[PDB]
Amino acid sequence: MIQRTPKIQVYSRHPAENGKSNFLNCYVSGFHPSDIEVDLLKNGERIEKVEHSDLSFSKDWSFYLLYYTEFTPTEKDEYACRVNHETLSQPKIVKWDRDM
């Protein structure tokens, strides 16, 4: 058996401009086993409004997932990716960093 902790990257499809329609992405990669919970949060609240995702498997025993939703960024809204996985002692919350 193998367990691997997920890598989590949160990023917008295009550079973020307030009031411009866009896509927010969570790429959750390199995790094992596949059991996982992933959500995008808008100021702490689960974004339900359509969710697309994409799962894949690499033969070194690792799963890869792209999770994304349409969003119009504003100055005041905070976004984060919330991930739970058995390798984590607590749910992991990774904030979207608009600038870096």
Residue numbers in the entry: 0 to 99
Task: Quote the study's own text.
To determine the molecular origins of these processes, we compare here wild type β 2m and its W60G mutant, to investigate the correlation of thermodynamic stability and conformational flexibility versus aggregation propensity. β 2m is a single-domain protein, characterized by a seven-stranded β -sandwich fold typical of the immunoglobulin domain family; β -strands within the protein are named from A to G. β 2m is the light chain of the major histocompatibility complex (MHC) class I121314. While β 2m is highly stabilized by the interactions within the MHC class I15, when β 2m is released as a monomer, it may turn into the etiological agent of dialysis-related amyloidosis, a condition triggered by renal impairment and the subsequent chronic accumulation of abnormally high concentrations of β 2m in body fluids. β 2m deposits in joints, bones and muscles, lead to movement impairment, bones fragility and articular pain1617. The introduction in the DE loop of a residue endowed with higher conformational freedom, such as Gly, relieves the local conformational strain and results in a β 2m variant thermodynamically more stable in solution, with a decreased aggregation propensity. The three β 2m surface mutants that we rationally designed (V85E, W60G-N83V, W60G-Y63W) were produced as recombinant proteins, purified to homogeneity, crystallized, and their structures determined at high resolution (1.75 Å, 1.49 Å, 1.70 Å, for V85E, W60G-Y63W, and W60G-N83V, respectively).
